[PDB]
Design an enzyme around this catalytic site. Structure first.
Site, short mmCIF file in Angstrom:
data_model
loop_
_atom_site.label_atom_id
_atom_site.label_comp_id
_atom_site.label_asym_id
_atom_site.label_seq_id
_atom_site.Cartn_x
_atom_site.Cartn_y
_atom_site.Cartn_z
N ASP A 77 2.08 -3.35 4.34
CA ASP A 77 3.09 -3.99 5.22
C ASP A 77 4.00 -2.92 5.83
O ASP A 77 4.18 -1.85 5.20
CB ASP A 77 3.90 -5.05 4.47
CG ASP A 77 4.78 -5.92 5.36
OD1 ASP A 77 4.34 -6.31 6.49
OD2 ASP A 77 5.92 -6.20 4.95
N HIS A 116 -0.40 0.44 13.43
CA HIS A 116 -1.62 -0.28 12.96
C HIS A 116 -2.84 0.62 13.04
O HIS A 116 -3.76 0.45 12.21
CB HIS A 116 -1.85 -1.58 13.74
CG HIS A 116 -0.82 -2.62 13.49
ND1 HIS A 116 -0.88 -3.48 12.40
CD2 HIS A 116 0.32 -2.94 14.15
CE1 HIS A 116 0.17 -4.28 12.41
NE2 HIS A 116 0.92 -3.97 13.48
N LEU A 174 -15.47 3.75 -6.00
CA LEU A 174 -14.45 2.68 -6.08
C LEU A 174 -14.87 1.50 -5.21
O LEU A 174 -15.44 1.74 -4.13
CB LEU A 174 -13.15 3.31 -5.60
CG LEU A 174 -11.91 2.46 -5.44
CD1 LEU A 174 -10.71 3.35 -5.71
CD2 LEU A 174 -11.84 1.89 -4.03
C1 LIG Z 1 -1.44 -8.66 6.10
C2 LIG Z 1 -0.45 -8.14 5.40
C3 LIG Z 1 -0.21 -6.67 5.36
C4 LIG Z 1 0.44 -8.96 4.51
C5 LIG Z 1 1.36 -9.92 5.16
O1 LIG Z 1 2.60 -9.27 5.53
P1 LIG Z 1 3.53 -10.04 6.62
O2 LIG Z 1 4.33 -9.06 7.40
O3 LIG Z 1 2.68 -11.03 7.35
O4 LIG Z 1 4.48 -10.84 5.62
P2 LIG Z 1 5.86 -11.59 5.86
O5 LIG Z 1 6.85 -10.48 6.00
O6 LIG Z 1 5.68 -12.39 7.13
O7 LIG Z 1 6.09 -12.46 4.63
C1 LIG Z 2 -1.52 -5.88 8.77
C2 LIG Z 2 -0.47 -6.66 9.02
C3 LIG Z 2 -0.60 -7.95 9.77
C4 LIG Z 2 0.93 -6.29 8.59
C5 LIG Z 2 1.30 -4.87 8.98
O1 LIG Z 2 2.71 -4.73 9.21
P1 LIG Z 2 3.44 -5.79 10.15
O2 LIG Z 2 2.59 -6.09 11.34
O3 LIG Z 2 3.87 -6.96 9.33
O4 LIG Z 2 4.74 -4.97 10.58
P2 LIG Z 2 6.25 -5.19 10.11
O5 LIG Z 2 6.82 -6.31 10.97
O6 LIG Z 2 6.15 -5.57 8.65
O7 LIG Z 2 6.94 -3.84 10.28
MG LIG Z 3 5.30 -7.39 8.11
#
Ligand SMILES: C=C(C)CCOP(=O)(O)OP(=O)(O)O
Ligand SMILES: C=C(C)CCOP(=O)(O)OP(=O)(O)O
Ligand SMILES: [Mg+2]
Ligand SMILES: CC(C)=CCC/C(C)=C/CSP(=O)(O)OP(=O)(O)O
Ligand SMILES: C=C(C)CCOP(=O)(O)OP(=O)(O)O
Ligand SMILES: [Mg+2]
Lengths: 244, 244
Positions: B24, B41, B135
């Site tokens: 995240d 990303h 892994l």
């Molecule tokens: C796909 C991933 C990395 C997990 C979800 O994180 P989000 O950014 O969607 O989570 P919230 O902060 O919306 O709970």
């Molecule tokens: C892979 C996913 C969808 C989550 C990656 O981070 P976010 O897209 O949630 O970015 P933040 O808003 O958390 O910074």
């Molecule tokens: Mg996020």
């Protein structure tokens, strides 16, 4: 069987948390630290929980689900389980009138038939006496676990399908939510006392987007100041529920 | 009818054997550095490969990584189309070398909702790596905890409907055998990006998992951050509901 998920499901979550979940952990170490007898921390559980209900009710909090006895706690010694199940029955009889005068509605979730018969009768009488009360709903999780909750909902859905009441394609988040024992609305905030950063088979399905608050404070020491800190912390978080 | 006090064993938990990873904070990493909106990303699966390499040497056997949730469909069509095309690209450019000590790669989630080209790329990645001996990297893509429990429920209902199992055979082990992420469950969950929540990841599978939340945005998460997370895990005491 096919899947499609890009079609939609509403999440039953929310300034102020409507539903708080509570893991009441650290009661043994609280007694060890103060050099007290082994079960003297657990004697504070229900009184403190009443104090928390009082504070939460005034702030506008509508639901509290508190973890009192998990399905894995059966692993402990016969002596501990018997002592603490007797203590729970006693405390529930001692603080009842304090909970009842605040207009608290009291419900128990978990497998009740595994409990001692006297505690089953005490629980049935507490639920009956308070079911009409209009204040805070206190849900006590007793012989409860997330695995159990999901399994009993799955069995309930299988039986319905067996009796011609639904198809495989009717099985969705809404049906499942209404078959679980802990229902919508789901906890906005989880507070775990006792320092551990884990969920210990509490409300697994219900905690999907819950905000977590872990504190080092042992449960007998969790007072009005600590609850206020946890809610202010919750108010400082940004909930996105996967969106932008 | 229920009974839970007899069957108090089952489950599947120095070094964590299975790590779960919520990747995240990628949008904020590009915003902070003033880069284009999706620049963070582009780092996701390259950094994920780096984490697998480090984790493989320390003896970790499984990593389950959250790449796209069932609620992320709520984001703009522009972001979703860009990110699924980027995953297809990154999945082709990495995870290609002929080295047998490299990762074996599985995808969990509803693949039929994804673009056909990404479906073909996933099929090719699972086929080319199925013989690898390192892994096990599980990539959670169009995945959520609700979805996993629901599809296991649907599969159990189907079998019961067709005479292949009894409702009284439904227990933790049969359910576990129907989920997409199975035993053994994650010993450690690492969430980058500052949020203290699970966001509908591995709900059932996280019942006794140790949680580690860090403020480090995922593109900055390197070897030192992973070694710190493992060290933190090693200082934790796991009781699984038991005592002494
Ligand atoms: C796909 C991933 C990395 C997990 C979800 O994180 P989000 O950014 O969607 O989570 P919230 O902060 O919306 O709970
Ligand atoms: C892979 C996913 C969808 C989550 C990656 O981070 P976010 O897209 O949630 O970015 P933040 O808003 O958390 O910074
Ligand atoms: Mg996020
Ligand atoms: C009702 C029975 C049998 C047990 C009590 C369960 C309970 C309140 C657990 C949390 S406090 P406990 O785990 O006993 O205390 P610590 O070891 O965590 O200090
Ligand atoms: C409050 C209740 C009933 C359970 C508390 O967690 P435990 O003390 O059982 O959990 P672990 O530390 O063993 O995970
Ligand atoms: Mg404890």
């Amino acid at each position: 069987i096919s899947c499609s998920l890009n079609l939609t499901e509403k999440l039953c979550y929310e300034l102020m948390p409507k539903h708080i979940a509570l893991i009441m952990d650290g009661n043994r170490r609280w007694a060890k630290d103060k050099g007290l007898e082994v079960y003297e921390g657990h004697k504070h559980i229900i009184p403190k929980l009443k104090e928390i209900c009082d504070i939460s009710s005034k702030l506008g909090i509508q639901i509290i689900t508190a973890f009192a006895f998990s399905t894995e706690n059966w692993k402990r010694s016969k002596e501990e389980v018997d002592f603490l199940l007797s203590l729970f029955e006693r405390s529930l009889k001692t603080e009842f009138q304090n909970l009842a005068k605040n207009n608290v509605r009291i419900s128990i979730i978990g497998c009740k038939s595994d409990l001692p018969m006297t505690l089953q009768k005490c629980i049935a009488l507490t639920e009956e006496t308070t079911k009409g009360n209009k204040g805070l709903h206190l849900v006590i999780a007793l012989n409860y676990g997330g695995y159990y909750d999901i399994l009993q909902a799955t069995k309930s859905i299988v039986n319905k399908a067996m009796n011609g009441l639904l198809d495989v394609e009717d099985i969705n988040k809404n049906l499942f939510d209404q078959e679980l024992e802990s229902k919508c609305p789901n906890p906005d905030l989880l507070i775990r006392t006792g320092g551990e950063q884990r969920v210990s088979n509490f409300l697994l399905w219900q905690l999907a987007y819950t905000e977590f608050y872990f504190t080092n404070t042992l449960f007998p020491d969790f007072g009005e100041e600590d609850l206020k800190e946890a809610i202010m912390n919750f108010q400082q978080r940004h909930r996105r529920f996967g969106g932008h």
